[PDB]
Structure 1
């Protein structure tokens, strides 16, 4: 299933559940989210949310950064959505000719 790693930090089951609820935005596209993996970590300037996810049509790899950790998580999602919507529709572009 979905795995969450908190590198050199400690987090609560509540925060892990928030991440799972935010990753659920990707379920919109109705494609298989295969072993999604979120890495959470703290730089000196703020938090870093990493993610690697494979789908039937490719991989999603994105990194979000921000002072506020929930915002870094959201920036991660925004980058992941635009990658997934690309994987799902790019092949449609050259139907003609």
Structure 2
């Protein structure tokens, strides 16, 4: 269960990185299919872009989200990502 992040054209402050990990953590409670995760967020005067990639036993999901800010990108990115994790998580726990 190891996760890492990479910021392109953005200063990675303990608070920022924490926010990202904070969301994933809350997901680590119900979601047990997370071993290696890599996230990247670009910050430009135009639009902010963020990408997420979660790993699962036998399968791997890769999605990306954009937001008005580095915070919004993570919100929608971790939102759609979670809902996706639950979908595939339903296949496993079949009882």
Bucket of the pairwise TM-score, normalised by the shorter protein: 0.7 to 0.9
Aligned to 1:83: 84
Higher-Rg structure is 1
Shift of 1:43: 4.7
Unaligned runs of 5+ in 1: none
Q: Is the 8 A contact 1:58 1:87 kept in 2?
A: no
Provide the alpha-carbon RMSD of the alignment: 2.3
Unaligned runs of 5+ in 2: none
The normalised TM-score by structure 1 is 0.80
The normalised TM-score by structure 2 is 0.82
Q: Write the mapping of 1:14-93 to structure 2, written as runs, cut at 5 A.
A: 14-43=15-44, 45-90=46-91
**Greater helix share, 1 or 2?**
1
Per-residue CA deviations over 1:34-68 (Å, capped at 9, x if unaligned) read: 11111111355421111111122522211111112
